[PDB]
Structures are given as structure tokens and as C-alpha cells.
Amino acid sequence: KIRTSPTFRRPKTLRLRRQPKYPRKSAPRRNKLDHYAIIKFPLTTESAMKKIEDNNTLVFIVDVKANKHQIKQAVKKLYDIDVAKVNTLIRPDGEKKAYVRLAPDYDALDVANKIGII
Amino acid sequence: VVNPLFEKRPKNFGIGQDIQPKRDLTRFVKWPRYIRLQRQRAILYKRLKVPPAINQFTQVLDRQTATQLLKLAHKYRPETKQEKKQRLLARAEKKAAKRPPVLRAGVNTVTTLVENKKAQLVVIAHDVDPIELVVFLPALCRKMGVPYCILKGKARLGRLVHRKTCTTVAFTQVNSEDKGALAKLVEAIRTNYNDRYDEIRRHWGGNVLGPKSVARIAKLEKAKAKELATKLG
Amino acid sequence: VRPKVLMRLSKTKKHVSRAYGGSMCAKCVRDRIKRAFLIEEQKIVVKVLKAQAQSQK
Amino acid sequence: GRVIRGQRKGAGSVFRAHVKHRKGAARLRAVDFAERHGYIKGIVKDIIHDPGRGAPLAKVVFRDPYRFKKRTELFIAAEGIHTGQFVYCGKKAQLNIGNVLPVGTMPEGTIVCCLEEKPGDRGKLARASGNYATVISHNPETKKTRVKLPSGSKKVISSANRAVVGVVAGGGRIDKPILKAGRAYHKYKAKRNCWPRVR
Amino acid sequence: GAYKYIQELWRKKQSDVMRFLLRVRCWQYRQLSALHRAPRPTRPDKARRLGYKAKQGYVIYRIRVRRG
RNA sequence: GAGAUGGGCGAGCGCCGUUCCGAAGGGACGGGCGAUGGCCUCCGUUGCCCUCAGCCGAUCGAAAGGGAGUCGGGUUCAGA
RNA sequence: UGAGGCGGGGGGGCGAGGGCUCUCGCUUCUGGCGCCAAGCGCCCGGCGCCGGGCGCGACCCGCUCCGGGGACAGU
Numbered sequence A: 001k002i003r004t005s006p007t008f009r010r011p012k013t014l015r016l017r018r019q020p021k022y023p024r025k026s027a028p029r030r031n032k033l034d035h036y037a038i039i040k041f042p043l044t045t046e047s048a049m050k051k052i053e054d055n056n057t058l059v060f061i062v063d064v065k066a067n068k069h070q071i072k073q074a075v076k077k078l079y080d081i082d083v084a085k086v087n088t089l090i091r092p093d094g095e096k097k098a099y100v101r102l103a104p105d106y107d108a109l110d111v112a113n114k115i116g117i118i
Numbered sequence B: 001v002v003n004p005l006f007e008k009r010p011k012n013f014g015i016g017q018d019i020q021p022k023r024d025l026t027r028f029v030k031w032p033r034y035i036r037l038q039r040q041r042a043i044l045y046k047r048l049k050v051p052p053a054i055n056q057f058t059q060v061l062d063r064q065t066a067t068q069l070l071k072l073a074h075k076y077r078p079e080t081k082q083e084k085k086q087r088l089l090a091r092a093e094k095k096a097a098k099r100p101p102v103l104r105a106g107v108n109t110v111t112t113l114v115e116n117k118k119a120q121l122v123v124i125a126h127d128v129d130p131i132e133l134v135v136f137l138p139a140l141c142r143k144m145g146v147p148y149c150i151l152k153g154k155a156r157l158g159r160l161v162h163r164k165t166c167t168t169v170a171f172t173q174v175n176s177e178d179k180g181a182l183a184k185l186v187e188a189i190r191t192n193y194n195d196r197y198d199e200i201r202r203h204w205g206g207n208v209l210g211p212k213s214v215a216r217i218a219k220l221e222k223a224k225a226k227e228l229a230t231k232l233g
Numbered sequence C: 001v002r003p004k005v006l007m008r009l010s011k012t013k014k015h016v017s018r019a020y021g022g023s024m025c026a027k028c029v030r031d032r033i034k035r036a037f038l039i040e041e042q043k044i045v046v047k048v049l050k051a052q053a054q055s056q057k
Numbered sequence D: 001g002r003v004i005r006g007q008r009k010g011a012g013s014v015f016r017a018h019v020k021h022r023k024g025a026a027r028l029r030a031v032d033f034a035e036r037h038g039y040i041k042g043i044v045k046d047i048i049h050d051p052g053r054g055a056p057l058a059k060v061v062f063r064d065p066y067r068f069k070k071r072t073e074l075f076i077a078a079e080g081i082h083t084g085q086f087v088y089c090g091k092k093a094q095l096n097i098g099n100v101l102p103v104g105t106m107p108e109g110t111i112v113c114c115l116e117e118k119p120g121d122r123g124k125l126a127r128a129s130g131n132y133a134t135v136i137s138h139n140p141e142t143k144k145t146r147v148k149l150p151s152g153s154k155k156v157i158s159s160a161n162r163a164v165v166g167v168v169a170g171g172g173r174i175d176k177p178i179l180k181a182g183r184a185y186h187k188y189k190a191k192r193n194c195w196p197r198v199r
Numbered sequence E: 001g002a003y004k005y006i007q008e009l010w011r012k013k014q015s016d017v018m019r020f021l022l023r024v025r026c027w028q029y030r031q032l033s034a035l036h037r038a039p040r041p042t043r044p045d046k047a048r049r050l051g052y053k054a055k056q057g058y059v060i061y062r063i064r065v066r067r068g
Numbered sequence F: 001g002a003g004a005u006g007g008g009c010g011a012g013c014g015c016c017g018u019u020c021c022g023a024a025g026g027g028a029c030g031g032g033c034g035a036u037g038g039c040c041u042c043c044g045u046u047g048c049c050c051u052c053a054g055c056c057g058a059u060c061g062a063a064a065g066g067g068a069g070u071c072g073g074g075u076u077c078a079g080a
Numbered sequence G: 001u002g003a004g005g006c007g008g009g010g011g012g013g014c015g016a017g018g019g020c021u022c023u024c025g026c027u028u029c030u031g032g033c034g035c036c037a038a039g040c041g042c043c044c045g046g047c048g049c050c051g052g053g054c055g056c057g058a059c060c061c062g063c064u065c066c067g068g069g070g071a072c073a074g075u
Helices: A046-053 A068-078 A108-112 B033-046 B063-073 B081-086 B090-094 B107-113 B136-141 B179-190 B211-227 C003-007 C027-050 D181-189 E003-009 E016-030 E044-049
Strands: A039-042 A057-062 A083-090 A096-102 B122-125 B148-151 D039-049 D056-063 D070-076 D086-090 D100-102 D110-113 D133-139 D144-148 D154-158 D162-165 E035-037 E061-063
Touching: A039 A068, A046 A057, A046 A108, A057 A068, A057 A108, A068 A083, A068 A096, B033 E016, B063 B148, B063 B179, B107 B136, B122 B136, B136 B148, B136 E003, E003 E044
Parallel strands: B122 B148, D086 D100
Antiparallel strands: A039 A057, A057 A096, A083 A096, D039 D056, D039 D086, D056 D070, D100 D162, D110 D133, D110 D162, D133 D144, D144 D154, E035 E061
């Protein structure tokens, strides 16, 4: 052994893995953002109906803290219809509005009657 | 026989000719702060005039006799933690159906049996950090006529008694077969530590200049001795 | 083109087939070749003049 | 009852130096093995103009003697330097304009610039436009050396510390009068907020 | 025991031994940080006289104060 | 320009300072060894020993600076 | 300063007259290239073949990293 570098760097020491003797939390907190706390209600707007007839998209009032990914799979689970693209915004009053464009092999009207809105 | 493509290509390590190889640099390393301090505090023990009470631990016991000292003491180790409970089950049957001499560790127990002059040989360790814990001792074993010596290493001293370290170890009593085995150690030690006292009280360690300076005085001490050596002839 | 565009282009759009191509102009390459040969031969000419130095001294 | 102007200049934050476009620290090349024993060859890559500094700077490129890497220093251009010209640095370096070498090797009456005033401090003395220093006397013993300075005072400096031969470029900068306050406004704008001086 | 000696030894802070040992520590302590933990106490005599006992949980911090 | 750590100061809340009194890298390559996964093939995972490393100052700082890549037509009472 | 060749001691090379004192440890004509060992020696591991290690190359010895101050600045 000799010194080649004229400097002294600290050697790498064996840093173990965290192995606690007891979990700090006894219970894993359940996800409060499940599928039903993520879609509050659809829209019954004279514009949203125009959005349903023409563009084949549904309009929901989703929670303020949902990704487009999460909204896509939520609808995909609650109404069994595949989603082509989601567009979201935040209304001035505060709640987040979502335009769920359905897949073209699906119909927005006959699924709007599946959930009552017309 | 040999492939004539094998050609020796030297690298001319001149000034600015080729790049220097990875030569050893263990002399110019910017050491950490704790190592840098760890050494230049040892230079201070070879620079400043060390007073005789602290210098007297640089002089130590020689090796070949120290192997006898520990081996003699290796039977006089006190009973371990494991032998202690085994020495309390023997008493546990003698009710249900003398202690030999041992070593003495710890300064606060050794001095209490040096003032009573019970020891035969008090061994110390040269490398105790707050040296104040010892420095009185060699001047006091000499006073009350107890043969002392200085062994290099409180660690190997703290190996007899199973601890991390120990400062002093005393021989209160011994067995009869090792009685004369001790006597040959006492005389060889007393003739170097106890009777050699007045020389030790006036031995100031240190006052040494560095090898980069004693070579600098000498280069002017040989040059000055070059002039007056051919002036008369 | 702008620097990040260079990911899009292929290799041959970004360099020219020559030693030091795409980095050095050809004129300062033949100059570099002419140099790096003449300096070495000047080393060999002096290496046999130094060989004819201590043959005497 | 008020803190005068010359008192406010030490606090800074308005009188601080404007160093946004300054190129760098115009220094020498640090002391090492080659500089002490031999000489080291360097190319003058190009010559540049440092804002605020009346002298021009020079980008000298050396080949590092320990790692496969080219090192670049910013020198203070001695007058007469041109790009591509080789600069040699060290004790064994030859004596010709634009070359650093310790003063103890240079002879008497040599005209040097970018002089060091402590061995291994990368030049501090006589580094303004057109200012040189003369090495008057030597002293082999004690390694000392008398050097007159651009103010006229002679300083006894060690002989190990080095300097680059020649006068600093940009000399004669002060002959041309400033004609208008605009020119003087533009000069001090590149250096620091000091210029319009109320009596 | 020995603690009485070290006690009476530390009262001789102008003797050659102590004036050596104090000028070394004062150099050694000065080359450190202003607050760092000493492993074992510099004065085991004064320590126990102030309530220190060698047992797990007793800690000692050596610190320097800019005098004046 | 702002601002932590180290350090320094400070009765103190805290301040100074920004590379300067610092063991300041948790990475890459190659090699060796045991181990798993899918046709444990071959690759990937993983440890340890060995190997090389300049990094240079945490971080913040622009809806006019730097910054890859969308345009054309149609549509609304109000958005493109 | 990326704390990179410090002080010694041995070594060869250039001289006046085989030791000692001395110079030297290899680079100046040019806007080129330069790293991650060549080579030699001593061992070992895999069916003549394929894969490894230590050392010389790159001298040895040391106590402040080299320099400049310094019991004075300074506090």
C-alpha cells in the first residue's frame, strides 16, 4: 500500500439497512382518495349536455387532488367504460372539473342514461 | 526466436518531457485534522525540555525480560467472571452436603498496598494519557523501597486483567515455587529503576531539533570545521 | 442548427469524413500533419547529431 | 452629525467593484517542482482585454506535469508578446521578454514586471499599464535582492520569488486626455461607483 | 488511594511538571473545535469530587471560552 | 444576489461567512466470488474483495434572459 | 497548493589537477502529439495452448505539506 493521491478522502463504511424492531405506525393508513371520494357528481349543464351529444365526453366534478391517470381508472372502474383522454381544470369556485372523453367504440349518451343524467 | 515486434518503449521522465508516474505520496498528503494533531503532539514530546518526572517513562523495560514478567504473572491473573461463579458453587455444596494470592490492579489499590509495603514488584505502563495519574508513583515506590518497573503498553498490561486497559499491576504475594522465580526478576529490575534514582531525577527529555535542522546546523558545523582545520595546516 | 437539435440529426449531418473532421478545418489539419512530421524528423536529425557528440567527447 | 462619503465607502454594497465582466484573477503560475528546478513551456493561446484593468491579459496554456490535462493561466501581458509565441517559466528559463524566472538568476539592471513580493504569491508588484521594476542589486548570501519600484522606493525582496521580463503592455494610457465627462463616466463605470466627485 | 496525590499534585500549577503538562494541553485543546466531547475526563480527581461517577450515561464536554 | 453545513463569534435569540481552520464522493467501469428469476440457458437482479474518480461548493434566484417539440380549418350565449 | 518530488545519503554523466570539493539527474527554432508501462527478472493457476502476482523500470533514509516571518507582530 502507498498513497497516490495527495489528498485524503473518507473511506466508504458499511452503512446497514433500516430494520426496526417495531413499526412506528401499527396500521397502514387506508387511501382516503379511493374511487368514490374521487368523483363527486356529474354535470347537468346545458353546456355539458352539448358536450355529451357532440363531442362524446362526460363531465364530472372530480376531487381537487386527483391525477388525470387516477380519474381515468376511476371512471374505468365505476362505469365500466374505457377512457380515451381526460381534460381537467379547476373552476373559480374551487372544485376540479374533468372532461372525460370516452373511447369511440363507446357511446356517451347511452352511458349518460346509465347514470340518470339527461 | 522472439517476435521482433516486441519493442521496448521507454518513458523519459524528464522535466516537462513526459508525465510523472504514480509515485508514492505518503509524505505530502493533506492529512485530516485529527491525524495532523495526532503527530505534531508527539513532536512536542521531542522538542520541549520534558521535565524529569515525565521523561522517566521513555526509559522502559527491555523485551526479553518482559516476556518473563508477563508469563510469571500469567498464572497470577485474578479469577475471571466465569471462574467466580464456579468458585461460588463449591461453597454452595460444602454447606449443602483458603484463597491463593492473585494480582492487584488499579492505582487506587496498588498505592494503598505500597504505603503498607505489601507489594514485591509494582509494574506500571508508560503510555497513560493523563500522565498525572502515575507520575507520583515511581518517586514513591523508590521512597518506601518497593521495586518498580515500567512496561511498554497499558493494553498488554490490561490483557492480564481482562479489561480494555490497566495502569498498574502489583505483586502482593507469590507462590513458593515461583518465589525464587520472582527473586531473579527483582534484582535485575532494582538495579535499573530503584537504585538508579538520582540519575533519573535529573534526566530532561527532549530538546532535540528536527532532522531538517540538525542537518542544517551540521552543514554549517562541518563548514566552520572546514576552515579552522586547514588554517594552521 | 441549435445545439439540442443535434440529437435528431444523424452522424453524417454532424461531421465530415476526415481525421479531426467536424472539429478542425482541413487547412489547419494538413498544417498540423506537416508540423507533426517535421518536428519528429528534427528530433531524429538531432538524435544522430547528439550520437555524434560523445563519439568524440 | 452625518456619516461622510469617504466613511460610507468601506461598507460597500454600492461602492463594491463591478466584476461582472472581469475575466479573472491575473496571477502567475504557482510554484511547483518544474518552476523550481527546470523550465516549462507554454503557448500564448490568445490575448484579451480585461475591463477595468488598463493592461491586457494573456491566456497562456501549459501542459500539466502530473495529469493528462492542459492547464490555463491568465497572465499580465508584457509588451511585445504575440499569440503562438512560447513562454518559458522556471529557474532554468532563458532571458527574453515575456518569461518568468526568479530574480536571483536575472542580472543587474534587468527590467521586469508582475513582480512577486513574497515567494509563491503569484505576482503582486508592478502590474499596471506601462509600469516596470528594475532589479538593482543582488546578495547570494541571505538570498536578498534590492529592486526599485514604479514609485521610486527600493525594496529588499528575496531572490526566490519571480517575475516576468519586460514592461507591461498598454503603456502610455495616460497621455491621451479625457476630453469629455462622458469618457470619464464610461471608464469608472467599468470599475466602481466613485466617479462624480463632489467637493 | 491515589486521588489524594493527584489532588495535591494539581495544586502545584507553577511547578515544572504542571507547567509542562498545562502548556501541552492548552496547545492540544486549542487545535480543536470549541465544543467537542472528551472520551474520559482530564481530571478524574476533580470529576468524582464534583459528582462524576464512571458509569454509562455520564458525559463530559470540553469547551473553550474566549477570555476577556 | 440570497443562504445552510464545517468553522468562528456570541450573555443570548442568534450573527458572521460561502470555500475560507473540513475525513465535504454513497457514484461509474472492470475483475473475482456466492445467490436468485424467467426455457435459473443467457441476461437482469444482489452482496462482498479489487479497481478508477479533481470536485468545489447544500439550496434558492427571471411568467421579458438560456431552454427539445403544433400548425391548418371548424365550433361557443362566454373557452380555444 | 488538487497540501505532487522537502532535507539528507548513495548513483551515473560533463572538467582542470583513482579518493575527495565542485557543475548535472536528461525538455528552446516551428500555434503538433504526450495519461491509463513498454521491456526484463522471480513465482503461480487452467487443458505445446489459455489465464494471474510481486519487484525493477520510477534509488535509499527521515519528525514537522512546502515556503516566509517568529518570541516579535498579535490578542
